[model samples]
Target: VQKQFREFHDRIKLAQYDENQTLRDERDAVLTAVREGLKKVFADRGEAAPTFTPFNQGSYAMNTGVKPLEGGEYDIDVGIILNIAKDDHDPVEVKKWIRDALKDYGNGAEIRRSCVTVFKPGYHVDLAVYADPELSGGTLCIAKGKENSGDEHRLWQISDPQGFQDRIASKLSGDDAAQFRRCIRYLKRWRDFRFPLGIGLTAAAYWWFQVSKRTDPVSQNVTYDDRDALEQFVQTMLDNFHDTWDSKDQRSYPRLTVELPVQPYNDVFEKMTGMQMESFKSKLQALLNALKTAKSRLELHDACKALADHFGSEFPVPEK
Candidate 1:
């Protein structure tokens, strides 16, 4: 179903409610249980309890969360920051302690490379562990984790949550930022339904919106609608894709890079292969062609059907 043209953006907005009050309540409840159980477990072993600060990471943290398909699982990344000396507990010990702490806390909790995941019926919470190094500055390092079934899983990886947040935040200003986030949610819905390449859409989004533009974004201070913002993004994406379509080498590598342009560089789309990149390029071209034709049509049905090709049933069809 495609949404009516008059309020098409509203339909996309509904898809953006990745975490509502009820979901947040459940996340908090699970974390509360994790904290209480952690302290008791540590105390029982005669080890002093470390200060734990639960924070958000990934999509929820970046405000780009998306609701999964109907009856599908919602993946929430919940991070935990621990204030403890590096010598007090190694990365492996830290992960084990946290994993053990939550072992009996949930319906089914398990240890992963990066976080201790607690599984619920409709959702799974990733509880990532970080060490708050008490040096000159209160810096943090996450439990570098490996996906091993047995004894070789502990790994420590350093990350800057604030840095990642700042990197995305610095891209736009005023109402533009809000619209950019919305655009991310919109594209995410499209990607979720069409073809998912993990971090491809998010990477493309950050690169597209990570700057100011001649046209102002839709905010209280601006007059443009969300439709304009959405189209502008699509236009830019098409332009970039075509620019490389006939390059000297025909663009051998992936066009989208998920690497954060900051210290401790991280590439979210690092695993994307050449074939996968080409697949995305083709999809973008198809969507661009559809959008170009539908942009000027005054009829809502034509527009809805055009976009519905990419955004799925939640987008809604016009009432016949």
Candidate 2:
């Protein structure tokens, strides 16, 4: 008998219960269990534990946007990140291993009372696993990755984290990398302001304004000392961002801790570039304002032209 009114409604599991403690215990236990399962699964066929490391946790019951539910309904995810070597083997092999491992429980989980839902809206726990490298930490395959779970899948072509990092590292001088890092910090700060709606929005708009302007593709022509470095820098950042985006890690942290694994990138960017941090900030501020007066892009074009004219007068370009 079909229920009257609506044909379908999301199953909202809203029961009052404490998961704080049990969650920690469960997570640790499951993580250990999965790792053991992998070891055994591989050993059964005379395979060794594939090189692996801890990737970021996912759907960790703490999404600021969405609070976790209680009771038997809440779904928890466990993950294992395997280090994949591109030169040694195909990345797909690692992915298949994860899928296989998911089916092979160490001694098998004692499901108190559980049921399987084929692509259900909720209440489905996933043993998400990924493979990557050590030095560059290249992720080969991911079991139900965040990007993979979306509406469409980007098959064949995938983001290259190692390449992105290598390129960015190669292009920038010590000073330049520092300057860009500062810019990144500023963006993070501006975007994360959870304050008065008016001020926060204003700040966000301003930061974005600066981002697009100083990094202006057209004006940059792009470079330092009237030499175009903009194209390369922007591409590097964009590529790195895409690589990060490809990561199945839905757990949002400020930035990928994957880079500079030995040293946390928190403030290390200071030494990478020769460019002054203050100059970048000042330029950022200038661009932010310029974007506002930019009515119909042509006006902006003219504004830039005017500035270039002034810039030329202020500092003449060197002879070829």
Candidate 3:
């Protein structure tokens, strides 16, 4: 493969809208492809069928950004966040047709076959698709994949996601990819604390909306002036809300993607809205600072977990 860099910082900075809706649509579409592709991949194996959840820690849930450790170098992934017992363990849920599923898109192509989420140049699609399978098949190897705790620094430090950077041999090729990722990380981290809570809050709001649409059809947000009209509005909002963030058409700060829209839907109004996501920024920042850099490990854990939960600061949900 030719060298590549996931350089979307400027694109992210420029995007201003619901990052959730857009990501979800493309992701779900990919899932459909996975469905058909898996059927074909496992048709030979007969019983070895594939199941999918189309979401993970990376972008599926909320894979924020990270900056360079020292120079311009970083990793990009669609992380899958989950609940598994491991201080430092490698567990992940890869489909029977995992590689084929990835190839279905023609980008983020995988030559390796371990599913910790695909990390390719220019872009990485967090592919941990362990959606509510626990409700069906208690524990399986796939479920284990759902729980790869990104506790190992080496996990995030390596270049090609499989410790393959060492194989690249070309300093220029490796360094450039690293630099591009560093910028991505920095942008993601910046977005972690920089934007008004509106960024994260809206995602939660969108999540809530998804739940209501699926679980509670009578939701207030689901206005039923008429069934047809309501359905149309729902679909419209879903599409608009989902396409909120596409670096292909967006804006950003020096490093972070701006979630707040411009004009009436911009930060000013969000700050003024009764729920005002802006109000929580300072508090979130203070809490995060104490948590990540605190002197005591115990305190840091508690603080990081507490602040993360309260502020929706969780990047990759079950990810990191």
Name the top TM-score candidate. 1
Candidate 2 residues 1-320, lDDT tens each?
00100010012112111335655554455556556757867888786777555432322321111122332233454444555544454333445554455455333332111111111232444444444535234434433222223323312122332333343334434544433333332232222221011122222222221222234566654232111122233233323321112145453222211132221222222232222333333443443443233333434345444323322222122232
TM-score of each: 0.74, 0.32, 0.30
Weakest 10 consecutive residues of candidate 3 by summed lDDT:
156-165
What digit string (tens of lDDT, one per residue) describes model 1 on residues 1-320? 12243244455443212546676777788777777778877898887877678876667667767777666667777778887765456666777777667677657677666677877787788877887756314557777654464445454556776676666667777767776776677677777677734345655666775422344555534343445556666667656642224355576543554565553566655555656667876777776666665657646677767777877787756764
Please give the ranking of all candidate structures by TM-score, highest first, separated by commas.
Answer: 1, 2, 3
Sort the predicted structures by lDDT, highest score first.
1, 3, 2
Error of 1 at 176 (Å): 2.0
lDDT of 3 by residue, 173-235 (tens): 343333333333322443454443223333322222221112255653422111122123224
Q: What is the lDDT of residue 63 in candidate 1?
A: 72
